[PDB]
């Protein structure tokens, strides 16, 4: 909510000036945030995937979608249709709340935090980052953590290029080294 309000009130104006956009619709928007956990160990134990899902649920506030192998892979000893991951797609209010929580609380709580790479744009203005420990998110309880699980966060943007994408995140003061 607050970050969404901030986007409209401040970010649009800053980006409009910076890129000399003709229209407000030209200004990049944060379409969605996807949180993914790749639980390879799930093949050995089904409960691990369930525990990972519960962690992703607590962080997201949203029940995760279980993902399954697209094709059989001998290397990873996985067969097609076997559940090997969980994902959540955050949009609208829930996305903005998560985005706020991540920047304000979770990112500071990262151990030895020295900023996030600004080279982690995919070339289309979309930013992906990895979280090594679920502990950083306050919702997770350190005492009750069975296993340390990381997750990968992707921010999908309407930005045409990385420069527009980095500018958008910079406008929100997303931490960058």
């Amino acid at each position: 909510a607050k970050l969404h309000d901030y986007y409209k009130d401040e970010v649009v104006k800053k980006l409009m000036t910076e890129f000399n956009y003709n229209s407000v619709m030209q200004v990049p928007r944060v379409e969605k945030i996807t949180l993914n956990m790749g639980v390879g160990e799930a093949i050995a134990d089904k409960k691990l995937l369930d525990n990972a899902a519960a962690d992703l649920a607590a962080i997201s506030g949203q029940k995760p979608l279980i993902t399954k192998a697209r094709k059989s892979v001998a290397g990873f000893k996985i067969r097609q249709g076997y559940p090997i991951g969980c994902k959540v797609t955050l949009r609208g209010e829930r996305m903005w709340e998560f985005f706020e929580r991540l920047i304000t609380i979770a990112v500071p709580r990262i151990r030895d935090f020295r900023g996030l790479s600004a080279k982690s744009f995919d070339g289309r203005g979309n930013y992906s980052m990895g979280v090594r420990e679920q502990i950083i998110f306050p919702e997770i309880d350190y005492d009750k953590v069975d296993r340390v699980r990381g997750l990968d966060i992707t921010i999908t943007t309407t930005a045409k290029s990385d420069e527009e994408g980095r500018a958008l995140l910079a406008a929100f003061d997303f931490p960058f080294r």
Partner: protein, 115 residues
């Protein structure tokens, strides 16, 4: 509970619990506690959040955790880049302080590797 970006044990006495932080030993732990005015015997769980904050300020005075690790890494890297005797010993994974290598030196060399 959480100091220097890590979680200290609540059940342990403060003096022991602080040693969980990298860069803090028993001496520094006692000094931090003395400055904070917190008794060594007091458990971390018993300490109030305000008391924990005072501890956090004291810990901030000393280089610890990631900052210390960066300093240590740089010091070793410098030696290896220098190509000084010590640097060469670091490169080869052999003792750097003139210990014997004919026998022992297992900590540096690792488990015995059969010919």
């Amino acid at each position: 509970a959480r100091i220097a970006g890590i979680n200290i044990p609540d059940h342990k006495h403060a003096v022991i619990a602080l040693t969980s932080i990298y860069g803090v030993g028993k001496t520094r732990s006692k000094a931090i506690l003395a400055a904070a005015g917190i008794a060594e015997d007091v458990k971390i769980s018993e300490l109030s959040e305000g008391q924990i904050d005072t501890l956090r300020d004291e810990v901030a005075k000393f280089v610890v955790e990631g900052d210390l690790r960066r300093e240590i890494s740089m010091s070793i890297k410098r030696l290896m880049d220098l190509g000084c005797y010590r640097g060469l010993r670091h490169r080869r994974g052999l003792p750097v302080r003139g210990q014997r290598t004919k026998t022992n030196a297992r900590t540096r060399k690792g488990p015995r590797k059969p010919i």
